[PDB]
Amino acid sequence: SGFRKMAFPSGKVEGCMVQVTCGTTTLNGLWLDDVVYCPRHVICTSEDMLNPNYEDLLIRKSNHNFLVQAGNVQLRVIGHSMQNCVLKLKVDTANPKTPKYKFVRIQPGQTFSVLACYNGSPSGVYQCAMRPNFTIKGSFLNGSCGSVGFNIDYDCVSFCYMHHMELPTGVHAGTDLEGNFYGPFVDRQTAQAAGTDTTITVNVLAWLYAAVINGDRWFLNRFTTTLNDFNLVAMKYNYEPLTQDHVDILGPLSAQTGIAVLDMCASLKELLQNGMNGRTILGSALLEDEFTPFDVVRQCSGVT
Amino acid sequence: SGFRKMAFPSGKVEGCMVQVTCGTTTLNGLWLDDVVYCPRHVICTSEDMLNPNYEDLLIRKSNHNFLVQAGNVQLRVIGHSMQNCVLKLKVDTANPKTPKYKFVRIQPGQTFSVLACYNGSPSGVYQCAMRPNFTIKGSFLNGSCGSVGFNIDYDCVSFCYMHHMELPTGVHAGTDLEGNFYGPFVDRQTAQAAGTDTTITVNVLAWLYAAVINGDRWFLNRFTTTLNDFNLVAMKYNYEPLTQDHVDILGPLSAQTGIAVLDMCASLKELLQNGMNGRTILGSALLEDEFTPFDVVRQCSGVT
Ligand SMILES: CS(=O)(=O)Cc1nc2ccccc2[nH]1
Numbered sequence: 001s002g003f004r005k006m007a008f009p010s011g012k013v014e015g016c017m018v019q020v021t022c023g024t025t026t027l028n029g030l031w032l033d034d035v036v037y038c039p040r041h042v043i044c045t046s047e048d049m050l051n052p053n054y055e056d057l058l059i060r061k062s063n064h065n066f067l068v069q070a071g072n073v074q075l076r077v078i079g080h081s082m083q084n085c086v087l088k089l090k091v092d093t094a095n096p097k098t099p100k101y102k103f104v105r106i107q108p109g110q111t112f113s114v115l116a117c118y119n120g121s122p123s124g125v126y127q128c129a130m131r132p133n134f135t136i137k138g139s140f141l142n143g144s145c146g147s148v149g150f151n152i153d154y155d156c157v158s159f160c161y162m163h164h165m166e167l168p169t170g171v172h173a174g175t176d177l178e179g180n181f182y183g184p185f186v187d188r189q190t191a192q193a194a195g196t197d198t199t200i201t202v203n204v205l206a207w208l209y210a211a212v213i214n215g216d217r218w219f220l221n222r223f224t225t226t227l228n229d230f231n232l233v234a235m236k237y238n239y240e241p242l243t244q245d246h247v248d249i250l251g252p253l254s255a256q257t258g259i260a261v262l263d264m265c266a267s268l269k270e271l272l273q274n275g276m277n278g279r280t281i282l283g284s285a286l287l288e289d290e291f292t293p294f295d296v297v298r299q300c301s302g303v304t
Numbered sequence: 305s306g307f308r309k310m311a312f313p314s315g316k317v318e319g320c321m322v323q324v325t326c327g328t329t330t331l332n333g334l335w336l337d338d339v340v341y342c343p344r345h346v347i348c349t350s351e352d353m354l355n356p357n358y359e360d361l362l363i364r365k366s367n368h369n370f371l372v373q374a375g376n377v378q379l380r381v382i383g384h385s386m387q388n389c390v391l392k393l394k395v396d397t398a399n400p401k402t403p404k405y406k407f408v409r410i411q412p413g414q415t416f417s418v419l420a421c422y423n424g425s426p427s428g429v430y431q432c433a434m435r436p437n438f439t440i441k442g443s444f445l446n447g448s449c450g451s452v453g454f455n456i457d458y459d460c461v462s463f464c465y466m467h468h469m470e471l472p473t474g475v476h477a478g479t480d481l482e483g484n485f486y487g488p489f490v491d492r493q494t495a496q497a498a499g500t501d502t503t504i505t506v507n508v509l510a511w512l513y514a515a516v517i518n519g520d521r522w523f524l525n526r527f528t529t530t531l532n533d534f535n536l537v538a539m540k541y542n543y544e545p546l547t548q549d550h551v552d553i554l555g556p557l558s559a560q561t562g563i564a565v566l567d568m569c570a571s572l573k574e575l576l577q578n579g580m581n582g583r584t585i586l587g588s589a590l591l592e593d594e595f596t597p598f599d600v601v602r603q604c605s606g607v608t
């Protein structure tokens with residue numbers, strides 16, 4: 001029993017983190033096979049970040065200007081290319097610790113683990129969600145860029161995020177491992193404001209199922225609702241609309257608990273309208289939305 | 305910026321997890337050098353757990369009855385001994401992945417990372433605190449016993465916890481790596497009720513400093529207090545008494561922020577008396593107490 005915000009074990013990703021330095025800028029790279037992936041803004045000064053022309057800045061860079069260090073050992077750079085907002089540094093040594101891996105572009109509401117790194121060294125691991133406004137709420141200091149987000153399915157690491165930017169509001173923006181930003185964000189130090197940070201309804205419902213499984217039951221009520229009725233309330237509270245696809249995804253938790261998805265919606269509706277009244281659910285005083293239905297099943301069933 | 309509940313990177317501990325089976329019981333062991341450490345209740349049936357005589361049960365066990373598997377490779381057991389509530393299984397192979405390590409017995413209010421495992425395979429990592437009643441609020445299913453808690457200082461793993469028991473209230477009890485339970489708990493399926501789960505005041509204050517550093521400032525007020533006045537309010541709210549030692553430990557955060565510890569106490573006093581009024585601090589609607597002052601400094605400074 002018990003339900004925690006749980007990250008994936010980080011060892012497979014620790015074995016991929018390297019330091020990348022270009023001139024006076026040091027950040028992290030991801031070493032898979034004989035390629036090191038890092039944010040292209042490694043080539044920028046803080047001054048450059050105001051209005052960078054990456055193609056123009058990159059002309060002044062040679063392979064020997066990209067210093068890549070794996071632990072205390074230097075890697076030889078034999079090629080570089082820019083793909084969207086990432087650089088791919090070809091090195092002459094395949095990472096001997098390269099796990100089975102994939103690059104995946106996640107959807108808003110999907111969760112992942114972040115291995116926060118500085119100078120190519122892992123500092124900590126924590127669980128994130130892709131917000132509906134395509135930001136993440138991370139923990140990233142200067143030097144953390146190129147830290148990655150990932151999921152693990154048994155022995156395959158799906159890399160989904162690389163850290164690039166902090167917005168003036170202290171939320172985070174980054175790319176997939178093809179270097180495409182999530183959402184509208186750019187790697188420039190400019191006016192970039194995030195949209196509404198809506199609540200991931202399907203994840204809240206998953207977490208309420210988790211709560212029932214783990215004996216937190218006080219919020220269960222005598223009511224049901226419909227998707228349309230629920231959605232009128234979601235809209236009012238800046239929750240994401242619940243779709244039949246979401247109801248289908250919650251089917252296994254519904255089955256395990258015997259609580260119909262629409263009955264759990266009506267519990268959530270009352271919690272939104274009435275608040276928690278100073279009560280807690282799984283140790284939280286707000287409705288938690290960074291567990292997916294898959295996360296809840298995984299943690300409640302003990303997948304390794 | 306941003307402040308997350310962050311675990312230590314788990315790779316160094318992943319490389320130490322093995323499966324231990326005795327008869328029909330499978331749980332996890334920790335393989336360091338040529339010793340595998342596991343809960344002594346591996347020798348029990350569920351029936352045995354009602355009133356186990358461990359010395360008597362152990363007489364019926366030989367080295368060859370302890371099946372130890374590291375990945376898909378069997379380890380040869382050449383000795384076993386019971387130390388308090390752990391078994392030490394001597395194997396004929398030193399763990400090649402043994403990190404620098406120490407065994408430490410932590411104090412209530414200290415935090416640590418847990419690597420939740422099943423069948424010797426890591427499932428997830430999360431951050432815990434030793435509660436003032438010597439329980440932890442973990443995430444542990446059948447098969448998770450022998451999962452460990454740890455801190456890392458650069459390259460040295462300090463192991464502080466091994467998982468043994470779930471209480472009927474769904475909180476967790478375990479031992480240090482010398483097999484001594486934290487608190488009054490025993491490895492028997494009996495009436496064991498936890499005491500008051502008081503709030504770790506010094507950790508709340510650390511987290512309020514973290515909040516100020518990360519731009520959450522609304523709760524700062526025009527008031528100060530004294531330790532004695534603060535402690536009258538702590539007592540009323542089931543907070544741990546704040547000592548001068550705690551004030552001293554908060555000195556670096558006080559210095560960084562320029563907020564006197566006693567002024568932050570007076571902010572906490574008002575939050576206790578007035579509540580949050582539907583506001584959040586670092587994304588929480590309750591006062592978080594599973595960050596130590598050391599955790600806040602580490603995360604705010606980016607230690608690897
Ligand atoms: C990337 S490569 O050098 O073209 C081929 C390769 N990929 C590897 C991954 C791990 C170990 C050796 C490996 N050789």
Ligand SMILES: CS(=O)(=O)Cc1nc2ccccc2[nH]1
Pocket residue numbers: 337338339397398399400401402
């Ligand atoms: C424990 S032992 O067999 O007595 C000595 C030992 N400890 C080691 C740790 C890592 C690799 C080889 C090692 N040999």
